[model samples]
Target: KTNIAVLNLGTNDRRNAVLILETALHLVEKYLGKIINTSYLYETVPYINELMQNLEESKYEENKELIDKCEEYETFLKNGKVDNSILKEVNVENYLLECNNIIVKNDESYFYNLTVVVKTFVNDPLSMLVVIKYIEELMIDIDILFFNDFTIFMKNIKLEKNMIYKILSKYIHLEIINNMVDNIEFLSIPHVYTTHRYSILLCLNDMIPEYKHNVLNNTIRCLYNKYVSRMKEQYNINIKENNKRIYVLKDRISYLKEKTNIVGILNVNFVEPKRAVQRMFEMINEGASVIDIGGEKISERDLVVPVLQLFQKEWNDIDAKPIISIDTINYNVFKECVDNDLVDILNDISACTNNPEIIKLLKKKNKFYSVVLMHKRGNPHTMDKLTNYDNLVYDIKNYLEQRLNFLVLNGIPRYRILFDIGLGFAKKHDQSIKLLQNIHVYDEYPLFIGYSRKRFIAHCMNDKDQLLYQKNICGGLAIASYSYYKKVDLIRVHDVLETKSVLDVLTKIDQVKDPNSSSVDKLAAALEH
Candidate 1:
């Protein structure tokens, strides 16, 4: 038996909705296997008193029996001993019948409801339930709705029909109940209220369609087509194309045009060189075309040289060899790597101004090694005070252009050189924002900007209460999105997996075409036919 748990999550707290959900998903993945399926996130009004109100007016004669039954169930609840016989006596059909008429009135406050399905190998179902209940306590409002074909209704718990429908409606057509395999189990599958409440059904139909939904007798694809058509005609709501882009980069970087290229930052300051090499290999696997490696403090050449050598030897021993970038400003560090042919790109934070000899050596060595000329105002110690700019965007652009030209003239090929705007090196919050807003100013060269977990993001949000995990990546994504839109060539980020995923989706959206007609117009025209 495939053990499946359908989870329904809700939160009245809108402020932390994303964070709460993200945390829940992480916890789920940690405890459970990777989530197999998930339903569309929906925002519906609070169902505070609507169930009883609908029961009162559903039809006096028919519903009075249900009202009395509800009272009997409540009485059992009040007594604090829920007799299993009493649970059986309740008409599951009547509650399912009235569910559609229970209109939850639109209100000021709302609940964000999301469903996730996971498969577990734990043979004991109740043990899975215990872990789920423990996880529920970790978050604000989360409910584990279904454990395979079973339902738990106890005296201590409120029978929330809103959530119950989400779980049971999927398998209702499968008739876990109709045969009454276990009389108590008849309550397990709540009958389908309407196709409108069948998001769970749609998701599961794709996953476990062989289970057979008897009445709806069609694949989820057909059901979804009908659902979309109904929504279009009735509510006049068409599915919006996800943020579409009409323009493409004119002077494109060949590899980066289809998607935002990820340059994974692998700061090599570890005691164990094998761990550093393993991390580099891991970054490459995580979709980083290039790996930026430097020490925590690069000024100490004695500390940096041996570690770089160890990494070089270890990297040679490994099967995978990604383009390795040596991020440094010290002349000796660059010389050590370049002399031994240990590096591909010189990711000079100093813009190679202090060590002009590094550029001369690249020219002298005549290797095809690239250079990342990052623009900054001054040395790290004095750069904070050097944040003054007459015209920030133009000042940086002019500087980048001059440095780029100088590197080219000094025998570095223009194609082999990329530009980094050196975010957070010397610039304050406002300056960083100004530079980010005008990323197109340096579009002449292949661009690489590192906005990962920068203090500027922290300074922008200014919420001391926010977790560093939340603060770091959220703002990094925003910058990455903007960078992608502006057609910057590469994004240097610490959070490679997430940033890469976001960019990949955007790339898909950008590349997909209608071929025949605008999809919105086509769907509209089909409705007329």
Candidate 2:
């Protein structure tokens, strides 16, 4: 027999809230003989209302009535009113109070309303539409916040009827798009692909119409250049540029962009300098703006010099326009390489240039640099002997600060460096979670998070199957959502395009509301959901 089982009830049917509460009260009265518990109720926030409005009709009006009824019952139960015959000829209120004291609480009450709406509409044909619309609204809101004062905007905006209706319409449109895709399996693969496609669409949709058109045009031009290079390289075809061919390539590029604008540039780890340069050029030809350079520990004499030299050659070849990020382990070794003039060839030094020499060089060259800091627990081989929470947090802060101090000493501006709370480097599952939650503590610099498919997924599922691969993808979504919520600057991940898609939806859903709208029912629903 299970000693404890958690029962989750949704507030989709506001009318059902009362019934659900009453049922719980009866169960406790008959079984445990006492009903004493703390209850938390939250009102719907504007973002949630936007989600509901985009996906559904004016269910808000009906939900409002149900919320009022729930409030009445709550009041009666709180004030010791004896409503005995309400359900079973038993004093439901008295019994509830006698069996278990009900203490009510609410957190971000307004946001909860949107959650309730989603839960209520999940089985409805309008669910997918509503979710998509809500995602759009959230993404728009996030974009607005990024450009404006999100904190003030969130606090000052009030939820209104018009906003709700607007969101509902948006949700309907999103559902239409999803239907067109004909890929409704929400398991993992389709979810990722759908999310990616939706994100690109949202970005394009949210852009100013004229700017969007211009971007589309430029993107096509870039794609044509890529195709021309590919044809020449593969088939030795040196076809002269013609208006007809240009027009055709432009159309193809436009079609591809319409399908998905965000593209992933995978930076494979290379051993030879020529290989790295060739890869970089290939990515550039493929219209990649961001490149991931794999980081591995190599002999200081063999690896560092050649990698920096290769980057220098590539920088000269490409005019240093793209953002190149190299992953590195062993901060101590990374620091040593920087100090020993190993990274001197690359004009731009963005890794947290904490070493005195590297910082001095960056300042002298007027180059900007960015650094990523992470929390490493222990190796997987020694996972049991990982760092404690308090120690890990303290060490990360101290080490980051120490590195920053070096940058300051060497004249590197504070804004140039970025920080990351490394997840799954060496830490056990629980510790990694703690680091993610407490990322705000290191808010002194721009934040970057990389939580793509680590061991924690397996730990969460407790399953040892191929399904585990999907966990990384899911983890990416969860991390992206959390990072967006916290307003982090960047998220490093193998699935960059997928993460971007999730953010696009979330950002749109965040924007519509009277920040001060009463969302008590929605809040309650969010908690319940």
Candidate 3:
């Protein structure tokens, strides 16, 4: 029996071994004979000692039990827990195990801290396939995930009902299903998420590089040297490509596009509405095509009337009146803005409690105004107060969709509606990160990402004067890169020029086809600092 306890799985290690081999069709049976006697090809020898390798010895002998027990004794004694005993000592030849013969170990990484279980068919095979009618009748209710490395490259994905149902279900234990459902932790067979993120120090050619002296030297040679011994002269490794390899990594270089092709929002939300005119002009000049300003910073929803009043006059009077937005929830200020038709966009940062009043105000104006729906579970400023959900991704998606249906039901045009996953309003820091990582899950609507001098930015990195923390307000140039990677439709930020610079880098790198261009020079230069 394979001891499941050692592995954090079923029963004991022995039980796991039994289960892995119990069914005649479980693929594990194909390996581990006295040797690998699979029907596929050659019968190769398994791990054994020197004397056991002698054909005149147990190498060709029938009873392999003595050698197997000798290994068990060595393993235990190797841990300093038992006697070092070998039934029959035999000298063995140096042998290199095939990569496939390396045992797969357990890993703990699951999609950015989200927990999941993976059941790989690596140990199982089906001689025949069929869904048990009773199992098929059971509701296909569990949330499951599947993929190799494609999910990351494929944007976000949502699991459909019963896709994994194609599996030969006869071997599934009903109790495990119940346990998984009760805990809301189902299963997966992710490619990388399965084994890549943890439990190993592996290097893929372009995925990673060999570290040397300061880190390591050559790829293959460095592995055994750095790990096996500190004094072996052969611990020396040469960079491959014969004599052509370059050992130095150019400083963390990245390229910037000569121009930006994606639109960004200069949400200058930090600007005092009264003090925003000059900044508004500056933001537009700095490459922000759209601007959204905060009205009330509280649940009382006080509309900054002075700010709106200033904008109402200056809006149409500007050189080229850019699209302007008001951030609000519920009325008084909202009604006031509605009364004057002050904003080109109404950014309701809530599902909205003002409700019929907001809808009524819009009906009275009967004008085509864009509505940016914010996905917030509770009222403004209720940070993490009542934010727990069984599944945040689906809950938020459902809420936004319902609010969207409500808006259109009341006459707001469908195309005019957009969505924002309210980052700080009602979320813990890690929860916010989870939402950010999964924004691609909500890919149906245009996502508005706001990264400025917000509290979330406050938590970035600690400093005595909070220099890195505060400068990050403008240095939010980095955040711009994230949203652009997601292909977000709008980005709300305070520092327009900085974000523009960062977006310039991200877009250039992502769309790079030119091998040697201005990007290489600019990227190397930027990385220098």
lDDT leader: 1
lDDT tens digits, residue span 1-529, model 2 = 1011111111323333323322332222222111112111212112322332332232222110101122322332232232222112223243333222111211211111100001122222222323333433232111110100001101012333444445445333322433312322111100111112222222222111122111123332343455456658897865322111000010011111111122233443435666766665665555444454544364534544455557666566653344554454434544544554333212112233323333333322112234444435444567456655567766776766665544433323333444556677656687778777787785434555566667775676565565678776786677778777776655555565566668778767876667645586578778994
Error of 2 at 294 (Å): 2.5
Can you write out model 3's per-residue Cα lDDT over 1-529, one digit (the tens) per residue? 1100000111112212222111221111111112111110001111212322222111111221111122322232222232222121112111112111222333221110111112222222111111212222221111111211111111123332343332323233222222222222212211222222221112112111231211112442345334335323554633221111111001110112122222334333334565566666677778776677664454323335566567677766654455666776655666766667565666777655455356444433113456677876666556569777788877887888777655543434334556778787677767777888898875545466565666666565546567766566744665666677666667777667777777766666668577687788998999996
Per residue, candidate 1 scores C-alpha lDDT tens digits across 318-376 of: 63356677778777777777787667678887788876767755533113356788889
User: After superposing candidate 3, which stretches have Cα over 4 Å from the reference?
Assistant: 1-274, 297-303, 315-319, 354-356, 363-366, 379-381, 457-463, 509-529
Maximum-TM-score candidate: 1
TM-score quality measure for candidate 1: 0.48
TM-score of each candidate structure, all chains considered together: 0.48, 0.38, 0.43
User: What's the distance in Å from true for residue 274, model 2?
Assistant: 8.7
Candidate 2 local Cα displacement, residue 449, angstroms: 1.9
Question: 462, model 2: CA deviation in Å?
Answer: 2.3
Between prediction 1 and prediction 3, which has the larger TM-score? 1
